[PDB]
Design a protein around this ligand. Sequence first.
Ligand SMILES: *[C@@H]1O[C@H](CO)[C@@H](O[C@@H]2O[C@H](CO)[C@@H](O[C@@H]3O[C@H](CO[C@H]4O[C@H](CO[C@H]5O[C@H](CO)[C@@H](O)[C@H](O)[C@@H]5O[C@H]5O[C@H](CO)[C@@H](O)[C@H](O)[C@@H]5O)[C@@H](O)[C@H](O[C@H]5O[C@H](CO)[C@@H](O)[C@H](O)[C@@H]5O)[C@@H]4O)[C@@H](O)[C@H](O[C@H]4O[C@H](CO)[C@@H](O)[C@H](O)[C@@H]4O[C@H]4O[C@H](CO)[C@@H](O)[C@H](O)[C@@H]4O[C@H]4O[C@H](CO)[C@@H](O)[C@H](O)[C@@H]4O)[C@@H]3O)[C@H](O)[C@H]2NC(C)=O)[C@H](O)[C@H]1NC(C)=O
Ligand SMILES: *[C@@H]1O[C@H](CO)[C@@H](O[C@@H]2O[C@H](CO)[C@@H](O[C@@H]3O[C@H](CO[C@H]4O[C@H](CO[C@H]5O[C@H](CO)[C@@H](O)[C@H](O)[C@@H]5O)[C@@H](O)[C@H](O[C@H]5O[C@H](CO)[C@@H](O)[C@H](O)[C@@H]5O)[C@@H]4O)[C@@H](O)[C@H](O[C@H]4O[C@H](CO)[C@@H](O)[C@H](O)[C@@H]4O[C@H]4O[C@H](CO)[C@@H](O)[C@H](O)[C@@H]4O[C@H]4O[C@H](CO)[C@@H](O)[C@H](O)[C@@H]4O)[C@@H]3O)[C@H](O)[C@H]2NC(C)=O)[C@H](O)[C@H]1NC(C)=O
Ligand SMILES: *[C@@H]1O[C@H](CO)[C@@H](O[C@@H]2O[C@H](CO)[C@@H](O[C@@H]3O[C@H](CO[C@H]4O[C@H](CO[C@H]5O[C@H](CO)[C@@H](O)[C@H](O)[C@@H]5O)[C@@H](O)[C@H](O[C@H]5O[C@H](CO)[C@@H](O)[C@H](O)[C@@H]5O)[C@@H]4O)[C@@H](O)[C@H](O[C@H]4O[C@H](CO)[C@@H](O)[C@H](O)[C@@H]4O[C@H]4O[C@H](CO)[C@@H](O)[C@H](O)[C@@H]4O[C@H]4O[C@H](CO)[C@@H](O)[C@H](O)[C@@H]4O)[C@@H]3O)[C@H](O)[C@H]2NC(C)=O)[C@H](O)[C@H]1NC(C)=O
Ligand SMILES: *[C@@H]1O[C@H](CO)[C@@H](O[C@@H]2O[C@H](CO)[C@@H](O[C@@H]3O[C@H](CO[C@H]4O[C@H](CO[C@H]5O[C@H](CO)[C@@H](O)[C@H](O)[C@@H]5O)[C@@H](O)[C@H](O[C@H]5O[C@H](CO)[C@@H](O)[C@H](O)[C@@H]5O)[C@@H]4O)[C@@H](O)[C@H](O[C@H]4O[C@H](CO)[C@@H](O)[C@H](O)[C@@H]4O[C@H]4O[C@H](CO)[C@@H](O)[C@H](O)[C@@H]4O[C@H]4O[C@H](CO)[C@@H](O)[C@H](O)[C@@H]4O)[C@@H]3O)[C@H](O)[C@H]2NC(C)=O)[C@H](O)[C@H]1NC(C)=O
Ligand SMILES: *[C@@H]1O[C@H](CO)[C@@H](O)[C@H](O)[C@H]1NC(C)=O
Ligand SMILES: *[C@@H]1O[C@H](CO)[C@@H](O)[C@H](O)[C@H]1NC(C)=O
Ligand SMILES: *[C@@H]1O[C@H](CO)[C@@H](O)[C@H](O)[C@H]1NC(C)=O
Ligand SMILES: *[C@@H]1O[C@H](CO)[C@@H](O)[C@H](O)[C@H]1NC(C)=O
Ligand SMILES: [Cl-]
Ligand SMILES: [Cl-]
Ligand SMILES: [Cl-]
Ligand SMILES: [Cl-]
Lengths: 388, 388, 388, 388
Amino acid sequence: REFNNLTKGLCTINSWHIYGKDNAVRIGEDSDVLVTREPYVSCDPDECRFYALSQGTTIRGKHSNGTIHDRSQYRDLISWPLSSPPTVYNSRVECIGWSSTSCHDGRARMSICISGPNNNASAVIWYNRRPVTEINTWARNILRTQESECVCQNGVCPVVFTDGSATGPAETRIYYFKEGKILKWEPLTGTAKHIEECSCYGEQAGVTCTCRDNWQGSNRPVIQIDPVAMTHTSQYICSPVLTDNPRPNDPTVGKCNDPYPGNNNNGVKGFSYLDGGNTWLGRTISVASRSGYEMLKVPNALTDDRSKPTQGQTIVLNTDWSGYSGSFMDYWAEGECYRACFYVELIRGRPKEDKVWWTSNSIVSMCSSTEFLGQWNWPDGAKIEYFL
Amino acid sequence: REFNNLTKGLCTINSWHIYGKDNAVRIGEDSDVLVTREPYVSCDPDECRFYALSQGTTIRGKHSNGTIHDRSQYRDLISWPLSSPPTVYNSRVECIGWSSTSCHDGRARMSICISGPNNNASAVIWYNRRPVTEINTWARNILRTQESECVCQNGVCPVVFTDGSATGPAETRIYYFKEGKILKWEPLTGTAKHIEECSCYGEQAGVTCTCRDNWQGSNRPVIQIDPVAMTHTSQYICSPVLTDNPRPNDPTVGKCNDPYPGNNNNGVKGFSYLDGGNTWLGRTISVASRSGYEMLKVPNALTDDRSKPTQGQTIVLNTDWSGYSGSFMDYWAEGECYRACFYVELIRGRPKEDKVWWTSNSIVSMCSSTEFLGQWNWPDGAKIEYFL
Amino acid sequence: REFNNLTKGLCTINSWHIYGKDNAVRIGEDSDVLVTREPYVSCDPDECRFYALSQGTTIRGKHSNGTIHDRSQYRDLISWPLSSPPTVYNSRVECIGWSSTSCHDGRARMSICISGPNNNASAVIWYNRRPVTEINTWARNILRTQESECVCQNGVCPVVFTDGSATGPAETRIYYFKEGKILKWEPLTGTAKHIEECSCYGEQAGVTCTCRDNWQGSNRPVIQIDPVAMTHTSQYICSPVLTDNPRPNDPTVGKCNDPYPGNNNNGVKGFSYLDGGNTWLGRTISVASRSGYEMLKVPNALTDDRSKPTQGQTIVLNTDWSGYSGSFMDYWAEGECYRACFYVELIRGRPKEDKVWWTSNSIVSMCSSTEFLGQWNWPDGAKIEYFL
Amino acid sequence: REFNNLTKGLCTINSWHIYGKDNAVRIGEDSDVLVTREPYVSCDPDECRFYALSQGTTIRGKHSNGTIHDRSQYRDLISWPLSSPPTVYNSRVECIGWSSTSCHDGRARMSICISGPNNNASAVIWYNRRPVTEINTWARNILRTQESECVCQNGVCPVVFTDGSATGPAETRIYYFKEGKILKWEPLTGTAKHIEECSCYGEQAGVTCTCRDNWQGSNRPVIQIDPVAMTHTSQYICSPVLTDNPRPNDPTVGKCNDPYPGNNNNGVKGFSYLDGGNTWLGRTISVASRSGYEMLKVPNALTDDRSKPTQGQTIVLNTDWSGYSGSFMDYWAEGECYRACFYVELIRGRPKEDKVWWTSNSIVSMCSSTEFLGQWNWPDGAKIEYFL
Ligand SMILES: *[C@@H]1O[C@H](CO)[C@@H](O[C@@H]2O[C@H](CO)[C@@H](O[C@@H]3O[C@H](CO[C@H]4O[C@H](CO[C@H]5O[C@H](CO)[C@@H](O)[C@H](O)[C@@H]5O[C@H]5O[C@H](CO)[C@@H](O)[C@H](O)[C@@H]5O)[C@@H](O)[C@H](O[C@H]5O[C@H](CO)[C@@H](O)[C@H](O)[C@@H]5O)[C@@H]4O)[C@@H](O)[C@H](O[C@H]4O[C@H](CO)[C@@H](O)[C@H](O)[C@@H]4O[C@H]4O[C@H](CO)[C@@H](O)[C@H](O)[C@@H]4O[C@H]4O[C@H](CO)[C@@H](O)[C@H](O)[C@@H]4O)[C@@H]3O)[C@H](O)[C@H]2NC(C)=O)[C@H](O)[C@H]1NC(C)=O
Ligand SMILES: *[C@@H]1O[C@H](CO)[C@@H](O[C@@H]2O[C@H](CO)[C@@H](O[C@@H]3O[C@H](CO[C@H]4O[C@H](CO[C@H]5O[C@H](CO)[C@@H](O)[C@H](O)[C@@H]5O)[C@@H](O)[C@H](O[C@H]5O[C@H](CO)[C@@H](O)[C@H](O)[C@@H]5O)[C@@H]4O)[C@@H](O)[C@H](O[C@H]4O[C@H](CO)[C@@H](O)[C@H](O)[C@@H]4O[C@H]4O[C@H](CO)[C@@H](O)[C@H](O)[C@@H]4O[C@H]4O[C@H](CO)[C@@H](O)[C@H](O)[C@@H]4O)[C@@H]3O)[C@H](O)[C@H]2NC(C)=O)[C@H](O)[C@H]1NC(C)=O
Ligand SMILES: *[C@@H]1O[C@H](CO)[C@@H](O[C@@H]2O[C@H](CO)[C@@H](O[C@@H]3O[C@H](CO[C@H]4O[C@H](CO[C@H]5O[C@H](CO)[C@@H](O)[C@H](O)[C@@H]5O)[C@@H](O)[C@H](O[C@H]5O[C@H](CO)[C@@H](O)[C@H](O)[C@@H]5O)[C@@H]4O)[C@@H](O)[C@H](O[C@H]4O[C@H](CO)[C@@H](O)[C@H](O)[C@@H]4O[C@H]4O[C@H](CO)[C@@H](O)[C@H](O)[C@@H]4O[C@H]4O[C@H](CO)[C@@H](O)[C@H](O)[C@@H]4O)[C@@H]3O)[C@H](O)[C@H]2NC(C)=O)[C@H](O)[C@H]1NC(C)=O
Ligand SMILES: *[C@@H]1O[C@H](CO)[C@@H](O[C@@H]2O[C@H](CO)[C@@H](O[C@@H]3O[C@H](CO[C@H]4O[C@H](CO[C@H]5O[C@H](CO)[C@@H](O)[C@H](O)[C@@H]5O)[C@@H](O)[C@H](O[C@H]5O[C@H](CO)[C@@H](O)[C@H](O)[C@@H]5O)[C@@H]4O)[C@@H](O)[C@H](O[C@H]4O[C@H](CO)[C@@H](O)[C@H](O)[C@@H]4O[C@H]4O[C@H](CO)[C@@H](O)[C@H](O)[C@@H]4O[C@H]4O[C@H](CO)[C@@H](O)[C@H](O)[C@@H]4O)[C@@H]3O)[C@H](O)[C@H]2NC(C)=O)[C@H](O)[C@H]1NC(C)=O
Ligand SMILES: *[C@@H]1O[C@H](CO)[C@@H](O)[C@H](O)[C@H]1NC(C)=O
Ligand SMILES: *[C@@H]1O[C@H](CO)[C@@H](O)[C@H](O)[C@H]1NC(C)=O
Ligand SMILES: *[C@@H]1O[C@H](CO)[C@@H](O)[C@H](O)[C@H]1NC(C)=O
Ligand SMILES: *[C@@H]1O[C@H](CO)[C@@H](O)[C@H](O)[C@H]1NC(C)=O
Ligand SMILES: [Cl-]
Ligand SMILES: [Cl-]
Ligand SMILES: [Cl-]
Ligand SMILES: [Cl-]
């Protein structure tokens, strides 16, 4: 009944605890589980759910051949119950498309999916399970959005979109929606430039997004959004603890307003929680492939160009496949602070495991503890040989 | 709690955006999807659902052999969640039969199903999930109805039925129901010479139906119904943009008050939105077979016998199978106008793809935008070789 | 919120219309459909459902081998949505056992199931989904009940049980329940000589049951119950239109107070609607086997020992398998009378089709119309060959 | 809306009636049933459900291979409707891990799952479907809890936890939670210190738990908890009817304050209802294998070291597999007492049936009757040879 306001700060993060795990690929070896990728998690006032882009086929089904491809007519944003797998029978379609975001504002949920050919894509903004607003491509080259949840404050939900070639004229915009309607949009300003796949969280009347720089992948760009003024700033994480993938090795000194020299072609969606001495960064363990995942406590990573880890937690061993990662919180939990959470996408199949013809994932998710908990590791758990 | 009244006009149609798509044939290659045909979409105040006639078997089931046939004791009207497939586990039976319609009046849903042998069929009218009224065949020759949603105003829901020859004069009746009871019926009047499979929508306290003249016409008949006076008139779409299938080639001048000659004893369910300058027609791209689908902006198509397209949008390529098409709208959405929507039945299997022994379909659905959106095309997406 | 009272009479029955049909055997050929038998239908104030005894296995499962047998530890009373099949995934277990009844009193549902070995069986009486009362075997020989719905008036629900052979020591009782608690029971009085598998309906503050006399199968015994006084009477249907199976051929003159001499210790559960000139009897078409099903209008069948048919309706052809049949009505429908309904069990597999190792069924169900509707026939529709 | 208080005593137990049975291994031979072990039952105010630890795979799935192991990253606590099987499509995940407990307080449900490697495990405590509190391992050796439901009084829910090696000996604590927050914990005082797998019930403002001695057991430890004072006592069951497994043969005289001489370390989770002359003990029939199950009425078992059976009931034949057992009650039923219930885990596959590569279970569950009812036996019912 009331729109949520971001009235709390983050809980103290002393470690991370298991929150959700779906075991999708294991279970899908002998049940009707949809092929997916680009998962996330998002909460309503009364429920938290798993989200992803379906490929319009089961994993065992013959149509799973070809699912390495990102964009097709057969994809849809689906949601399903926390830690259940995305099955044909339990998965609810939010909207049709191959790039998405979604968030609840306290009264109802906004979901956004983009569909089309690369040169003629469009977003449809759904609100309360009905289409409300559409937005045509402005740069005619893969209009695309966060692939994780947005965040609202008093009914205003900023969303980050990008359109444009990997090398070409790109334009990133922040749209501000309320009940699925456009209040305002703005082109990206500050020092962060060639941005995508923003992972956002809200606290203390502000939205923080950690993104990916598509021109040089090393230290991540950050957007700080004021949802009342409908303004933003941008910058890079200064810490020499680099969190894109592939990435150079960690130097001694990082960069605050430019990317640290990195590659151009193909980073990874990732996230962080930037909160002074309560700062944690996530990254893949490998510097070159989407393998492993760990969380590192890096006090003042945002502003301190010499900042190094003072604590850590392994999530996924380096001998296991990871993937995209992103932030979410339960903005409707009890208590005096918001508990940081995140998910890691555990990609199985193509290209790394090319004895199968499909690509899919499962999900692991964690939230923060004020305790210093023991750590385990959380693999996907399926055996590729079983699918041969 | 209150009956819906058709108080709004249509939104301006500047383009069509993706609404829903179930990918049912793809998915059903390896999951328990029911064989269907004659699908449609209908909204309740709090939800929109897909509808179709089940064939009482899944697609991989051996009882899928013989499913090209229309009429059997194993068919039922089913609904399921929007953009999900019609599965054995998520499909709710509305009623039993092989010709149907369904609509919600704001307070509850009326569903109608006809069953029986060709010479002894009967309609059962359900309201609030209970049978209320039955109507026996009046001409003993395949009693049949819309195969897409009806429309209500202040509790009054007109429905079009036909009984008699598909290839000659037959007896069409317009029934007016409230709460599943018959308020009145009328025989068809106006200049439409033959009527089947009306596709209807409501606005400004009237219902417009675009139908199929199976006897002689390749232009479509139109019924316009006043649900307050409980009266109707009929004519043809005057436009030389002919919308049945098979059909002759578009002439320069159409016919308003008689069927456009050239093709007899055949046709396909279709629809249009006939709103002055805001008029759009749907059709198969091919003139010979149920392949492709396009929307064409044809100002005043209803009344103007020389009207040609001023804009268009491809929905399904002519290299892909289409099928029936129909109109629906969400009469309980927010805003100041009703947004026009339609679906296209994407038929797969027999008779065009006769290496399988079944006939089934998937659904694609679109709604109007006030923007000028980029177009995609939306095939069924399944590979027939996978079913062999 | 209020207990239902039986305040209406029966609608005029001029024909029967299709109500529900699950096509369960067809569908279960390639989906996870539970093996069942002894089905029925029962309504809540807001929903009608299908009920049956599960066999704790799917049809295609290897444990379907041996499901000809009636009594095992793996059976339960399950309910599921009208006209869906009983699947693993959608079936709700009401209670455990191999004989059942169930009814709603207007405030909550009572369900009764019996389990045990033949010499030591017991009923558990559940109300509002919790067990309330239990009753031990009184004759130590297959304590058993209706296998169709009971009927309630002002919260009193009579239920007929039997315990004992058709030979040895044996006793039928009518228990009167309120909120699952025993008010009173009575041993069978009247001219009915043995009794099982009663099929009941309510009207004008009375419950009429048509039962099965398993010593001699010809004309059916009938129990008439006053749920206010909690007393009853019994007699036989006088009509020479005989309705059990196996049965002798129809004579000229029937018997009112004894069975017309019939096939010994064999039977089928059946039903009738007894209402003067508005009397209809159901029966198998075959006099030898559970084959075909018809409805016959036999005015004053209860009291007129020469009454023959004035009207009829074929439900299942004699070249198709039938089974148990029973009565139910929607006591919470709109209008001024109760509409008579029935179901027929369509038994497939053993013993009549022994190339499969299983026994299961599907359901067809009809309700009365005041119109004279055309007739179809409603076979199960599965092909046994497909299961080989 | 209110916290439940334990204001009632136990009903008189004169026999046990069938309550629920899921037939999970039978059904799962040909449907998507999840592999489980460590089941139990727990009620909310409006529903009772089955619970267990999933193994993150179906039984027919290839990942069922290896499911003899207890502790993996692929386990979760799931719940599903009473007497349905735990399927991929109807199981709801409560939390992730490999040891659990769950209970409702009248207002919401608390669920505790522990995960981690043997030396670094942690509990997350969920309340109203959100994580609230975490507890790290205190002895670094398989932190572990009840594996059946907890009981609440006025919002306070005691839970027993164990950490430590069985040869340590191990340490036990009682935590007292309210709304998922720790009110208090205390170490095990008294005569029984080496305790695990507590099965609890509530009555007359106190909680009684029957457990497994992990040091030197035969007879079972008992903890009596006062949830208001948040204090406890401990002793052993004096009776010479020994209810662990393996165990020596029943002696004439038992032991109240020390374990009866028997096995080293290993045992089985079990339960009792200790209520003076209305006292019943559960045990496996077999002295050495998890085979069979029986209830024995053993007056004053708790306090009388010569007490022997005055009445019994076979639940599972000795020639059939059993497993864990535990107590639960419906604290929200009608009437003046709480009705004692329990479940038995029916283990199939490894180690006993090693011709399959998996280990799973089904459930049978019973509630007490004040009647003297006939007994049956309730096997799992699956044929292993079907799975080969
Ligand atoms: C990103 O996405 C974008 C958004 O989707 C996409 O843009 C869209 O592109 C599509 C594909 O091009 C466009 O869709 C087409 O729209 C056409 C209509 O629009 C054009 O034409 C009209 C009208 O033109 C007449 O009128 C004007 C005004 O007087 C004259 O100036 C013209 O010369 C012309 O006059 C002729 O016709 C008159 C009667 O109309 C006669 O009186 C006269 O004498 C002449 O003969 C113009 O208004 C339009 O201009 C406006 O928009 C354009 C952009 O498109 C601007 O450049 C311009 O400045 C204006 O703003 C425009 O030119 C449809 O006609 C077209 O559909 C036909 O073609 C397809 C095949 O392509 C057929 O499938 C379809 O059936 C239609 O053709 C059949 O039917 C007609 C009618 O009977 C027949 O004449 C024709 O021969 C053909 O018949 C044959 O096939 C039939 C089918 O099988 C069969 O049944 C018959 O029997 C027969 O065999 C199509 O829908 C779409 O609108 C664009 N949308 C927008 C918003 O721009 C963009 O491309 C995307 N980007 C990328 C990179 O992909
Ligand atoms: C049960 O569970 C618990 C709870 O989880 C387990 O305890 C946890 O154990 C893990 C594993 O050890 C710890 O994670 C590591 O944390 C460290 C940070 O902590 C260390 O450093 C702190 C800071 O030191 C600085 O300050 C001090 C004084 O101020 C000064 O002395 C020092 O020199 C420096 O200036 C120390 O404060 C801290 O000490 C404290 O904690 C100790 C226990 O951890 C305790 O003994 C102490 O007494 C004290 O209280 C401690 O020394 C992270 O640095 C580390 O992360 C690095 O290592 C992992 C591999 O382990 C790697 O994957 C990470 O990426 C990272 O290393 C890379 O990045 C570095 C930064 O650039 C770079 O230097 C490295 O060369 C390396 O980079 C290379 O690889 C990366 C990745 O591939 C690549 O990108 C690069 O380019 C390059 O090739 C871990 O996160 C947990 O914190 C700890 N938790 C707790 C609460 O204790 C416990 O072990 C479990 N028990 C059992 C039995 O198993
Ligand atoms: C479209 O749909 C419509 C609607 O469904 C279809 O029309 C329906 O058609 C069916 C099929 O014919 C009819 O069902 C049969 O009904 C008759 C009863 O109606 C007839 O008899 C009435 C009574 O006659 C008596 O009284 C009158 C005066 O009252 C007197 O004149 C007369 O001489 C006699 O003494 C007549 O009133 C009635 O006439 C009326 O209706 C006619 C329409 O039918 C109309 O033309 C007339 O103008 C008039 O208005 C009519 O003549 C049932 O008797 C019959 O049931 C018997 O036969 C079937 C086989 O068809 C069998 O399965 C039944 O069990 C039963 O016969 C067995 O039992 C008898 C009693 O013991 C016994 O005598 C028989 O020998 C036989 O016994 C053997 O078999 C059984 C079973 O296996 C075994 O147990 C025994 O031992 C033994 O071996 C049918 O139910 C419908 O009533 C009719 N509905 C309507 C509204 O019309 C229409 O056909 C469809 N259209 C198309 C084109 O397909
Ligand atoms: C229809 O269903 C109904 C209802 O369910 C069926 O009726 C039920 O029938 C069963 C099976 O008979 C009964 O269960 C048994 O109950 C007895 C307890 O009752 C007996 O003992 C009572 C007390 O006896 C003592 O006191 C009296 C004086 O008070 C003294 O005289 C006597 O010598 C003794 O010292 C008697 O009061 C009681 O009699 C009453 O009831 C009778 C009917 O049962 C009736 O005839 C009488 O007139 C009177 O009314 C009765 O005789 C349990 O003891 C028994 O459980 C033991 O036996 C089973 C094997 O069957 C075993 O599995 C159990 O563990 C247990 O035996 C083990 O433990 C003992 C204790 O330590 C030990 O001493 C045993 O040697 C044995 O130990 C061995 O095995 C275990 C496990 O493997 C192992 O751990 C040890 O190390 C060792 O190796 C049964 O539970 C039901 O109570 C009864 N219910 C009712 C209401 O009647 C009916 O039969 C069904 N009808 C049909 C047709 O099927
Ligand atoms: C939320 O915060 C805004 C400030 O921008 C305030 O106007 C609004 O009243 C607050 N919403 C409530 C009362 O929940
Ligand atoms: C709907 O419109 C009718 C007139 O056609 C009017 O009488 C009725 O009051 C309206 N329904 C409501 C209550 O919205
Ligand atoms: C039902 O009938 C009884 C009398 O037999 C009456 O007292 C009771 O209140 C009635 N229930 C209603 C009004 O629904
Ligand atoms: C439950 O009992 C407690 C005693 O600890 C009491 O204080 C509280 O008021 C009771 N709550 C109720 C009435 O539900
Ligand atoms: Cl592998
Ligand atoms: Cl193909
Ligand atoms: Cl057959
Ligand atoms: Cl076996």
